[PDB]
Design a protein around this ligand. Sequence first.
Ligand code: 0ZE
Ligand code: NA
Ligand code: NA
Lengths: 250, 10, 29
Amino acid sequence: IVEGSDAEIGMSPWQVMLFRKSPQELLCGASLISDRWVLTAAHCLLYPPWDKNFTENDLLVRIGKHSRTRYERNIEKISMLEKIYIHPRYNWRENLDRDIALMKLKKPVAFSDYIHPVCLPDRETAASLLQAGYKGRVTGWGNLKEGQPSVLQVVNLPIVERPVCKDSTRIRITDNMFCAGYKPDEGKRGDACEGDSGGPFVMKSPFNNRWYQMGIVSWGEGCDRDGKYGFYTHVFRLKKWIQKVIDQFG
Amino acid sequence: DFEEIPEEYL
Amino acid sequence: EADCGLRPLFEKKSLEDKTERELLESYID
Ligand SMILES: NC(=[NH2+])NCCC[C@H](NC(=O)[C@@H]1CC[C@@H]2CC[C@](N)(Cc3ccccc3)C(=O)N21)[C@H](O)c1nc2ccccc2s1
Ligand code: NA
Ligand code: NA
């Protein structure tokens, strides 16, 4: 996260760390949607161009974390994956279209002051909130500059209109994506950065006061460059697939 | 840079 | 979920984090 600030304890109880057993190292962010399901970006598990291709055995899921490197004895819970599910139509070849994957935990985690799932938007919630100018919040342990924080970082960023998004890049933008960030204008900065991948973009409903995850950190070009924006997987657009997965697989 | 985690985990 | 998105240390105690106002004030306050 670029130009963010340290999160408060218990601020994003759904923040998950995707952790590599060997070498032991942060892979990506992710989020808890229930006691047995974690949501992340598919490009965090499979990215052929870079020879990335994780399996269940390869990874560890760390929940209730604050410190990046410390093992938070009695706070954090570490779990095992039972199964990874990647979008059948994830497009890693061209523009990370449909960049989403579910991870099924070996056992259900227990909720605590520091552990708690985020809500998934409903068609209605998506409609009123996914609007240019509305701010969302991104969190993560990723790079501070295009180096690594000692604690979880946070930043609030506005959603940008589809045309500004498209016109900021040469990569083809699809309906499964949205971009967020300030304009060179707005004279406020911030972005996600390398290592933030798979983290949640969330918004707080003004109607029921609940936190909803609307996007997943997907991709960008550099971090916090003027005239460039962060791109997120549009979660309500892939809601159907997620449903399908959860009730067909537990 | 990561602090060591317990074995029951790996 | 059911209990989703209500944070044990903020919502549940009715305490606000230090920048949530910023979000809410943008959904045009
Ligand atoms: N908001 C922003 N400003 N950017 C957010 C990026 C978040 C990172 N996502 C990425 O780095 C993703 C996955 C790899 C892909 C490559 C191209 C790029 N568009 C970056 C790029 C730009 C220009 C030339 C060449 C490459 C991109 O962001 N990618 C993530 O954390 C990572 N995912 C992976 C997956 C495997 C290994 C390492 C990482 S880091
Ligand atoms: Na373009
Ligand atoms: Na920018």
